[PDB]
Design an enzyme around this catalytic site. Structure first.
Site, PDB file in Angstrom:
ATOM      1  N   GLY A  39      44.635  40.463  36.907  1.00  0.00           N
ATOM      2  CA  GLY A  39      44.569  41.009  38.248  1.00  0.00           C
ATOM      3  C   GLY A  39      43.361  40.474  38.989  1.00  0.00           C
ATOM      4  O   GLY A  39      42.670  39.579  38.501  1.00  0.00           O
ATOM      5  N   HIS A  57      32.144  37.405  37.782  1.00  0.00           N
ATOM      6  CA  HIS A  57      32.889  36.374  37.067  1.00  0.00           C
ATOM      7  C   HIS A  57      34.091  35.877  37.865  1.00  0.00           C
ATOM      8  O   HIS A  57      34.333  34.673  37.951  1.00  0.00           O
ATOM      9  CB  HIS A  57      33.341  36.911  35.708  1.00  0.00           C
ATOM     10  N   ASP A  73      31.887  31.323  32.474  1.00  0.00           N
ATOM     11  CA  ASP A  73      32.251  32.084  31.284  1.00  0.00           C
ATOM     12  C   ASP A  73      31.013  32.481  30.482  1.00  0.00           C
ATOM     13  O   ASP A  73      30.928  33.599  29.972  1.00  0.00           O
ATOM     14  CB  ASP A  73      33.210  31.279  30.408  1.00  0.00           C
ATOM     15  N   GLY A 114      39.680  41.753  33.271  1.00  0.00           N
ATOM     16  CA  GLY A 114      41.034  41.505  32.812  1.00  0.00           C
ATOM     17  C   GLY A 114      41.950  40.915  33.864  1.00  0.00           C
ATOM     18  O   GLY A 114      41.490  40.427  34.896  1.00  0.00           O
TER      19      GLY A 114
END
Ligand code: 6NA
Lengths: 122, 122
Positions: free
Chosen positions: A31, A47, A89, A29
């Protein structure tokens, strides 16, 4: 962009991406990174490190082309950065699916992240 | 920063901020602005316009001090920009709370942002 990323995650995991991975652990997420809580969290760790290597395009904003062929994510040629972005991704979507077996809802939400242990350099 | 903003929204609404507003409508959470879908969405629209007036600080990363006094968000005295930033965040938390009555779950985990109509200028 976030749109393609979320779509890939949905396609691979069958789960709503925002609901399951919006703020999961120390790495999934908004941050930066942190010490991974588990295997799923480590997917997002990888990622975000993948994103760090990119130059020439914006990983959050820039759209790219990919297709869903025989239930496989196939990145379009695009250009150098956008293809590399697409592969970043694709990799996390696959990784998240492969670690659904140890997904833990106790890491789902939320407040955690600023207190996470600082992550090793990528 | 994001942490103060999230805490404010939790304090005002009593709701999990990332869960309820992470991808809500065309304006809440990730991304820029768009034509608002409802009152809750408009709060976030105003919020992002509030951020534009800021000169000198980072709304996402820069921490500031505030406190909870008589169940009221009270921005502590930091520099000019951080004070404005705190007041931007206070305003949206209050606004989201005020419009809980028309909060629509259909707009929640629904990443519709690429399809949003272009926002008017602030
Ligand atoms: C902090 C997560 C929700 C943010 C909603 C908004 O102010 O854009």
């Amino acid at each position: 962009s976030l749109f393609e990323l979320g779509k890939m995650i949905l396609q691979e995991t069958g789960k709503n991406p925002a609901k399951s991975y919006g703020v999961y652990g120390c790495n999934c997420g908004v941050g930066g990174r942190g010490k991974p809580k588990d295997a799923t969290d480590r997917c997002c760790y990888v990622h975000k490190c993948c994103y760090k290597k990119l130059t020439g395009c914006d990983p959050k904003k820039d759209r790219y082309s990919y297709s869903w062929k025989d239930k496989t994510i196939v990145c379009g040629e695009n250009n150098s950065c956008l293809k590399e972005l697409c592969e970043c991704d694709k990799a996390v979507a696959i990784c998240l699916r492969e670690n659904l077996d140890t997904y833990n809802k106790k890491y789902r939400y939320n407040y955690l992240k600023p207190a996470c242990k600082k992550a090793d350099p990528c």
